[PDB]
Amino acid sequence: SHMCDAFVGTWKLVSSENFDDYMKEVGVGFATRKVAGMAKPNMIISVNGDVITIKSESTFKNTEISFILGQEFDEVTADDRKVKSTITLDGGVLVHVQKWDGKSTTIKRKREDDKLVVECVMKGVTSTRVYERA
Numbered sequence: 001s002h003m004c005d006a007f008v009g010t011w012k013l014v015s016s017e018n019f020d021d022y023m024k025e026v027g028v029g030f031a032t033r034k035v036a037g038m039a040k041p042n043m044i045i046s047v048n049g050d051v052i053t054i055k056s057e058s059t060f061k062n063t064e065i066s067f068i069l070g071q072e073f074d075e076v077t078a079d080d081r082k083v084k085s086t087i088t089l090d091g092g093v094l095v096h097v098q099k100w101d102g103k104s105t106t107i108k109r110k111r112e113d114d115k116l117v118v119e120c121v122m123k124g125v126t127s128t129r130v131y132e133r134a
């Protein structure tokens, strides 16, 4: 067994708070914010050896990233930012930092009770998105 095994599974978004404001802070345009904010994605997380894959599937966009912990990769985000991403495990929490254009945002993914909690931070603005097992 692997430590990320707690994250492995198919997850569905059941609540989202302050995501529009998070997206504003990130720089997402009006029309993208409106459509992306309406999305209720399924998040699919799998682990194969050292490689973790996180898929996001919704009516807005289907995204997929695969990565090894601590090793930087290029990511194109759902809002079409080209970012440099590094994901690490810090005391059981997946910490995902995205860097682009001199800016930085951090997305934390945590297991809490039976839920998977995603905290998105851009400067002083935090959005909390909660997922349950699908």
Ligand SMILES: CC(C)c1cc(C(C)C)c(C(=O)O)c(C(C)C)c1
Pocket: 023, 026, 028, 036, 037, 039, 041, 056, 058, 060, 061, 063, 077, 078, 079, 107, 118, 120
């Ligand atoms: C528009 C940007 C900021 C964004 C969009 C999405 C969806 C709606 C495709 C997601 C997500 O995969 O939940 C995320 C997560 C990485 C929180 C970010």
